[PDB]
C-alpha cells in the first residue's frame, strides 16, 4: 500500500576509484528495475540488453521552447483558421519567420502543457473512419493535473571509478503514500463532455460514446508516462477514462516510478535517472488527448 512496497533494498559489490579495491554498497531499487536470477539474487532490468548511461545530474529534463526556423529561399506558412482540423484548405494563412515556442514535452496518453484550442475542443484524425488511426483531441480550456512523490528521498553518492559517481537511493522517509496525480473531478467531467459533444459529430447524435482504459502492452504505452521534477512517472489513468455517455472532489491516479528509462521506444539505449533529493511536486496542464477507437 505504501511506497516501500515498491522498493527492493539491494546490496552489491561495486568498484572503487582504485581498480584493485571493491566496495560493499547498497541502494534502494524499484521493483520495476530489478529482475530476479534463478536475500534473493537480482539484477538490473536493462542489463542483458544494454548498459545504462546515467542521466547526467547537471542537465535538466525541463523542456525549453524551441522555434523551428526556415532557411533562405523557404517560408513557413501558418494556418490562422480556428476551425482548421488538420487537412484541406485554410482560408487564413500567414508567413511567419518561424514557429512559436514548441516545448518538447514528452508524455503519453495526455498532452501535458502546450497550446490550447481557440474556440472549442478540436478532434483531429488522419481518417476518422479508420480505427487504426489515433485521434488527437485538443482542449480549449486546460485541465490542471497535480503530481506528487510524497517521500523525502535521500540521494546517496557512490564512487564507481575515477571521477565517476553513481547516485543511489540510500534511504526513504517522510510521507510514504504512493506517488499519484490529482485531476479535478468536476473539471475533467465537463472536459469529457466537451470532447463527447465534438466527437458525436463524426459518429452520430444517437451513438453511445464510451471511454475505456488502455488495452495492454508496455508500461510506457498503458500508462500516462511522463517526466516531472526529473523523476519519471507512470500513472494509471483508468479513473480518467471510465465513463459511458448517453444521448472540490478530485480524481487520484496511482503512479509508479522507474529509474531505468528506455524513452524513445528503442531497445539497447537505456538511461538511469538518478534519485531526486526531497519531495517532488508537479503542476501541469492537460491540453489534449491521444485516443484510439475500438473496431
Amino acid at each position: 500500500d505504501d511506497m516501500r512496497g515498491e522498493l527492493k533494498n539491494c546490496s552489491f559489490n561495486m568498484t572503487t576509484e582504485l581498480r584493485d579495491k571493491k566496495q560493499k554498497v547498497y541502494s534502494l531499487f524499484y521493483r520495476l528495475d530489478v529482475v530476479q536470477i534463478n536475500n534473493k539474487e537480482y539484477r538490473l532490468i536493462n542489463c542483458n540488453t544494454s548498459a545504462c548511461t546515467q542521466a547526467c545530474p547537471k542537465v535538466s529534463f525541463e523542456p525549453i521552447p524551441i522555434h523551428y526556423c526556415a532557411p533562405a529561399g523557404f517560408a513557413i506558412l501558418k494556418c490562422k483558421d480556428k476551425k482548421f482540423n488538420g487537412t484541406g484548405p485554410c482560408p487564413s494563412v500567414s508567413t511567419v519567420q518561424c514557429t512559436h515556442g514548441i516545448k518538447p514535452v514528452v508524455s503519453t496518453q495526455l498532452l501535458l502543457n502546450g497550446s490550447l484550442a481557440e474556440e472549442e475542443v478540436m478532434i483531429r484524425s488522419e481518417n476518422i473512419t479508420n480505427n487504426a488511426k489515433n485521434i488527437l483531441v485538443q482542449f480549449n480550456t486546460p485541465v490542471q493535473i497535480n503530481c506528487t512523490r510524497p517521500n523525502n528521498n535521500t540521494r546517496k553518492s557512490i564512487r564507481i571509478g575515477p571521477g565517476q559517481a553513481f547516485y543511489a537511493t540510500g534511504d526513504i522517509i517522510g510521507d510514504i503514500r504512493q506517488a499519484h496525480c490529482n485531476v479535478s473531478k468536476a473539471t475533467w467531467n465537463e472536459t469529457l463532455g466537451k470532447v463527447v459533444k465534438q466527437l458525436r459529430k463524426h459518429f452520430g447524435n444517437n451513438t453511445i460514446i464510451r471511454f475505456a482504459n488502455s488495452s495492454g502492452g508496455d508500461l510506457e504505452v498503458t500508462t500516462h508516462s511522463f517526466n516531472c521534477g526529473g523523476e519519471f512517472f507512470y500513472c494509471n489513468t483508468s479513473g480518467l477514462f471510465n465513463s459511458t455517455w448517453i444521448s472540490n472532489d478530485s480524481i487520484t491516479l496511482p503512479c509508479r516510478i522507474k529509474q531505468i528509462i528506455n524513452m524513445w521506444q528503442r531497445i539497447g539505449q537505456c538511461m538511469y535517472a538518478p534519485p531526486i533529493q526531497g519531495v517532488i511536486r508537479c503542476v501541469s496542464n492537460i491540453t489534449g488527448l491521444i485516443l484510439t477507437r475500438d473496431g
Partner: antibody
Amino acid sequence: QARLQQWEGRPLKPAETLSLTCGVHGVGLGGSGWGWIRQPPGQGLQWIGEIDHDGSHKHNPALRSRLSMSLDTSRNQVSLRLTSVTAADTAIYYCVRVYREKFLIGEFLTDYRFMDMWGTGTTVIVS
Amino acid sequence: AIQLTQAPLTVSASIGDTITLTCRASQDISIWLSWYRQMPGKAPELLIYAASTLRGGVPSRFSGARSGTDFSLKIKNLQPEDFATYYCFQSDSYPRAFGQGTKVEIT
C-alpha cells in the same frame, strides 16, 4: 563488548580550549550520529551538540560560536573543542551515539534519534 | 525551543511498589520521547525510546505510554537497582532538551 570509552582530561585553567575525545569500540562512526551530553553537579543533563548521519552539525543555541566538533573516521574518535571555558562549564561530559530507528506513525516515516550508547564520564573542572 | 517538565522531582517508595513518572512537554512532540536512568555516580542508560519501546535488556516491568503531551513511565516490582534519577529526552525539534530529573529513592 560495544563500548564508548573516554579518558579524563585533568583540570584546566579558565578561558582556554576544552578538548575532549571519545573512543568508539565494538561499532564504528559510520551510519549513526555522535553527540555530547554534559551534567553539571547536582543538576540535570544538558545537550551540547551532535553530528547526524548526514554529517550535519546540530549545536545548542546557548553555546554560541564556541562549539566545534569533528569525527576521526580513521581512529574512530569523536572530538569536542569548546572554547573560552568559564567556571559554569564544570560538568561531566558524555559521548553518545544518537541511533536512528524508523517509527511509522499512521502515514509518516521518521528517523528517530535516541542516544543508544553512552560514554563513561569525563569530570571536567576549571579553576 | 521545547521545554520538558518532569514532576514530581522526588518520589519515594519501598521495594515492590508501582510508580508512575510524568514528563509534560511544552508543544506536542508526537511520541518522540526517550527515557534515561542515571544510577548515582554511573552514566545514564536508555530505558524506553519512542515513549513505548523497551530497550534490549530492560525488564518488562518498565513501560511508557501516551503520544501527546503528558508522557508517563510506569515501574512495576521495584528493586534496589531502580532507585536512580530518571530523565525524559525529546527528539522532535533540533534544540534538544532534557527533563529536570526525577530522583526515586526508598521511603
